[PDB]
Motif scaffolding. Structure first.
Motif, mmCIF file in Angstrom:
data_model
loop_
_atom_site.group_PDB
_atom_site.id
_atom_site.type_symbol
_atom_site.label_atom_id
_atom_site.label_comp_id
_atom_site.label_asym_id
_atom_site.label_seq_id
_atom_site.Cartn_x
_atom_site.Cartn_y
_atom_site.Cartn_z
ATOM 1 N N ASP A 146 13.852 46.879 52.856
ATOM 2 C CA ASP A 146 14.969 46.893 53.776
ATOM 3 C C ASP A 146 14.423 46.590 55.162
ATOM 4 O OD1 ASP A 146 17.071 47.369 55.533
ATOM 5 O OD2 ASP A 146 17.874 48.965 54.407
ATOM 6 N N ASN A 156 15.449 47.282 57.877
ATOM 7 C CA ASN A 156 15.626 48.438 58.720
ATOM 8 C C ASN A 156 14.466 49.404 58.568
ATOM 9 O OD1 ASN A 156 18.344 48.252 60.082
ATOM 10 N ND2 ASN A 156 18.686 47.621 57.977
ATOM 11 N N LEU A 157 13.754 49.326 57.456
ATOM 12 C CA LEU A 157 12.616 50.172 57.241
ATOM 13 C C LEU A 157 11.518 49.667 58.142
ATOM 14 C CD1 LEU A 157 11.289 52.384 55.513
ATOM 15 C CD2 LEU A 157 10.719 50.591 53.859
ATOM 16 N N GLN A 185 12.492 50.229 61.881
ATOM 17 C CA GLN A 185 12.315 51.549 62.402
ATOM 18 C C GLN A 185 10.845 51.856 62.510
ATOM 19 O OE1 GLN A 185 13.360 55.414 60.260
ATOM 20 N NE2 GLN A 185 14.932 55.092 61.822
ATOM 21 N N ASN A 245 8.896 60.147 50.672
ATOM 22 C CA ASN A 245 10.291 59.846 50.452
ATOM 23 C C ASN A 245 11.161 60.186 51.661
ATOM 24 O OD1 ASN A 245 12.360 58.785 48.826
ATOM 25 N ND2 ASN A 245 12.837 60.812 48.035
ATOM 26 N N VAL A 246 10.716 59.784 52.848
ATOM 27 C CA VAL A 246 11.470 60.004 54.078
ATOM 28 C C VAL A 246 11.552 58.710 54.861
ATOM 29 C CG1 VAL A 246 10.793 62.402 54.219
ATOM 30 C CG2 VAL A 246 9.484 60.672 55.397
ATOM 31 N N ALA A 247 12.438 58.642 55.836
ATOM 32 C CA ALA A 247 12.498 57.493 56.727
ATOM 33 C C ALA A 247 11.324 57.572 57.709
ATOM 34 C CB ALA A 247 13.819 57.473 57.463
ATOM 35 N N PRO A 248 10.868 56.467 58.317
ATOM 36 C CA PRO A 248 9.852 56.452 59.357
ATOM 37 C C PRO A 248 10.205 57.416 60.478
ATOM 38 C CG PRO A 248 10.236 54.264 58.549
ATOM 39 C CD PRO A 248 11.216 55.159 57.817
ATOM 40 N N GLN A 249 11.503 57.612 60.730
ATOM 41 C CA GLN A 249 11.953 58.556 61.740
ATOM 42 C C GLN A 249 11.538 59.969 61.376
ATOM 43 O OE1 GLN A 249 13.837 57.814 64.688
ATOM 44 N NE2 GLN A 249 13.215 59.936 65.057
ATOM 45 N N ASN A 274 14.802 71.453 61.298
ATOM 46 C CA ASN A 274 15.198 70.097 61.029
ATOM 47 C C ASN A 274 14.116 69.391 60.263
ATOM 48 O OD1 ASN A 274 17.616 70.378 62.323
ATOM 49 N ND2 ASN A 274 16.835 69.521 64.219
ATOM 50 N N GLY A 320 14.221 70.285 56.759
ATOM 51 C CA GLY A 320 15.317 69.619 56.093
ATOM 52 C C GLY A 320 14.972 68.184 55.746
#
Lengths: 339, 97, 48, 97, 49, 49, 97, 49, 48
Positions: A261, A263-264, A267, A307-311, A336, A339
């Motif tokens: 993606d 967007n991956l 980011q 299994n997380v976004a770069p953010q 957070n 989470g």
């Protein structure tokens, strides 16, 4: 006790990485760290050294190479013995150039086919790159280049002689250097176009500006990893490489090439630019310099492992307890992150 | 199996030690390609001389049969000669007509 | 309540629950929004 | 909890082309030969060029063939070494029996 | 939609193709970077015509 | 077997990367066939003369 | 009642020929040359034509031979992936033992 | 203590090149023939070579 | 042929034929090809 302790450290590095002492020394030379007085090494350097040895040793095991093979590729200690392979090289090149005129040639382009003929090389485009690389390196006691080589070859060398002149020591080392670089090309598995770019413009690969491209252990790993990356791109590799040499590569294009993606990568590109890295990542080098590309891809690989976004990865970095001395992340910030 | 290992090593030594090895062909390729390229420029020059002679003889300094690109670097010059032969044949036809 | 699904947004507990429910990250959740809604000019949806 | 093994994956390779465009033509020269003669000379020269072209193609094919055989012998050697290890383990297994 | 997706999914499995191969074949979005393969095409046709 | 997979991939890369690859011959065939066709017409014209 | 499986069956492929008719002749042209001269010139062109034909056939044979080598090599890779899965299961079986 | 055997070892061989350089040209000779004649005669022998 | 070349063009030193066409290491292979190029160069020089 101090000396005993330092001898012990050197031994442990060898035992740990399954090297003999001789091998540890050759490896350290290949690493470039070998010249350091380990006995008076700072702690930062020692830990760094262990990490370099770990990385390189793991890589050699991965590539199924011996330390001696690496050493051969990284060593600058060229032999001076004049062997049949070189005698044949010199006669071939000598005759091929008897009519050579610099006013009509850059020399390198002319030698390239004769050098390929003698280095047992399938492509003169590589020979061209190898001669160029060697000129930048200026290997041997004579700091040899193709032009110096030619002046000698045409003026002093007598084909079929077997004795020549005493300056042949420099010539022999140069010739071995060409063979060394040839082995690097082949063992690396780098694409010919990628190789020409590396030799011609090393900054694309993270070289210090103006530096001759290195062939030490770290350079070889870097190139090897680059080549593996290109193979992964596969049939879309051409697009990506063309956009690498021509500085047009972006996230959308690479993401398409890598089945990601966009967007991956976008980011991750941002996080690479927000966070401090040794080679800083900026908009100007995010998809142009290989080390910035590796940095971005590492942001992605970590995000994938977790299994997380770069953010998400960035938020976790932000919890660093040393940096927390000013941020003092609140419990809520930690909630957070959890989470 | 140990025997097979030794036999394999023997086959390899043969493969590398025989005269007709890879090293030979790399040498021959390199040397011939260098010759081939130079020969090509000379061939082109004669083709061009025929072209200029053609243009002189028929009083028509505009006709063109010889095009650039007969030698394609990507393919190491393969079929450059064939390309030139076609151009010469085209001239012949034009002359006869 | 608004949930910001922009891939570049930071989270909150509602956002976390939604990712949790689907076992996906923010980048793929953003794309999921575009699959469901090609008109939304932003990444924000209400918790409808 | 039983740890289930991960799926095997395919290996990839890239085969990105290189590229060099064709050559420019040399300057025309006004030879003294009449076209019908100069044509033949050019033709003979092109024929010799095509002969080199054929020869070079054959050399290249031979070069690649030898390179492949060398590769294959090295690959065989690696697999045999592994098989020797396996056979040795069979013997150890029999001692356990 | 579900029916079409199932048809395609079953078929890609049957043909042993990834969704990415399908996408390459079906995409109408084309690359603009000029690569060696195209440079060779342009010279080949340029001279041919 | 894992080694055989690697060796297999190496051999494939070799076939794709060696100079006399499929792309070469496809190119040579196409280019020559075009030459051969034009040459034929010229040869016929000469024969008719 | 045991669910006896259906028998395996043969695969077959179609190989339908294409068809293109031959060429038509261009208009006859009378040149200044007498018959024996033109006969030899025509003979020259035909000989060169047959030489190109030979070259083309050889290229074609190589083109197709290479396509086959690539095909076979890709197939080998596919079978290896299947074999890797089998061996992994073999190891799992031993763990079950 | 079981006498665990050593791992199998690889074999290797050397294939050191020989080297024979070229010689000198034979003495030239002035022929009674004009250049284009001798040129073709030389072409003839070189072709045979 | 080289000597005839020199006589006709009034040269004393022109050289096209050079040593080295025969490389013993490679059993003389391509010696003919080497000479053919040199003769072609001689011819071209004559024509110009």
């Amino acid at each position: 006790l101090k000396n005993l302790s330092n001898l012990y450290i050197g031994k442990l590095l060898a035992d740990i990485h399954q090297l003999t002492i001789d091998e540890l020394d050759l490896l350290l030379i290949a690493v470039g760290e070998g010249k350091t007085n380990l006995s008076a090494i700072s702690d930062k350097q020692l830990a760094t050294l262990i990490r370099k040895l770990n990385t390189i040793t793991s890589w050699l095991h991965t590539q199924k190479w011996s330390v001696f093979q690496l050493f051969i590729m990284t060593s600058t200690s060229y032999n001076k013995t004049l062997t049949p392979e070189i005698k044949n090289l010199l006669d071939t090149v000598y005759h091929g150039l008897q009519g050579f005129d610099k006013d009509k040639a850059d020399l390198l382009h002319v030698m390239a086919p004769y050098i390929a003929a003698t280095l047992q090389l399938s492509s003169e485009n590589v020979a061209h790159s190898v001669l160029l690389w060697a000129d930048k390196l200026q290997p041997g006691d004579g700091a040899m280049t193709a032009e110096k080589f030619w002046d000698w070859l045409n003026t002093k060398y007598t084909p079929g002689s077997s004795e020549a002149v005493e300056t042949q020591e420099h010539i022999v080392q140069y010739c071995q250097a060409l063979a060394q670089l040839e082995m690097v090309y082949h063992s690396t598995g780098i694409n010919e176009n990628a190789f020409r770019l590396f030799v011609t413009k090393p900054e694309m690969f993270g070289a210090a500006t103006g530096a001759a491209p290195a062939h030490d252990a770290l350079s070889l790993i870097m190139l090897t990893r680059f080549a593996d990356w290109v193979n992964a791109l596969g049939e879309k590799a051409s697009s990506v490489l063309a956009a690498f040499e021509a500085n047009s590569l972006t996230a959308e294009q690479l993401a398409d090439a890598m089945n990601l993606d966009a967007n991956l990568l976008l980011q991750a590109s941002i996080q690479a630019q927000n966070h401090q890295h040794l080679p800083p990542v900026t908009p100007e080098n995010a998809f142009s310099c290989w080390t910035s590309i590796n940095t971005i891809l590492q942001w992605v690989n970590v995000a994938q492992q977790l299994n997380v976004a770069p953010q998400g990865v960035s938020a976790l970095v932000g919890l660093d307890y040393i940096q927390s001395m000013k941020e003092t992340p609140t419990y809520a910030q930690w909630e957070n992150a959890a989470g | 199996l140990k025997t097979q290992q030794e036999q394999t090593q023997s086959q390899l030594a043969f493969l590398q030690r025989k005269f007709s090895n890879q090293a030979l062909y790399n040498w021959l390729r390199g040397r011939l390609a260098a010759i081939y390229f130079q020969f090509y420029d000379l061939a082109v020059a004669r083709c061009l001389m025929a072209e200029q002679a053609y243009r002189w003889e028929l009083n028509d300094d505009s006709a063109r049969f010889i095009k650039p690109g007969a030698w394609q670097g990507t393919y190491a010059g393969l079929l450059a000669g064939e390309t030139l032969m076609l151009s010469l044949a085209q001239m012949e036809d034009a002359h006869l007509k | 309540e608004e949930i910001d699904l922009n891939s570049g947004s930071t989270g909150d507990w509602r956002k976390t629950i939604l990712k949790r429910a689907f076992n996906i990250d923010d980048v793929s959740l953003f794309r999921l929004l575009k699959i469901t809604d090609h008109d939304n000019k932003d990444g924000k949806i209400k918790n409808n | 909890i039983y740890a289930t093994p991960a799926d095997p994956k395919a290996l990839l390779s890239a085969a990105v082309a290189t590229s060099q465009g064709g050559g420019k033509l040399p300057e025309s020269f006004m030879s003294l030969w009449r076209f019908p003669h100069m044509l033949e000379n050019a033709r003979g020269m092109v024929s010799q060029l095509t002969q080199f072209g054929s020869t070079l193609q054959n050399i290249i094919e031979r070069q690649d063939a030898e390179a492949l055989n060398a590769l294959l012998q090295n690959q065989a050697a690696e697999l045999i070494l592994t098989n020797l290890s396996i056979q040795d383990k069979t013997i150890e297994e029999l001692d356990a029996e």
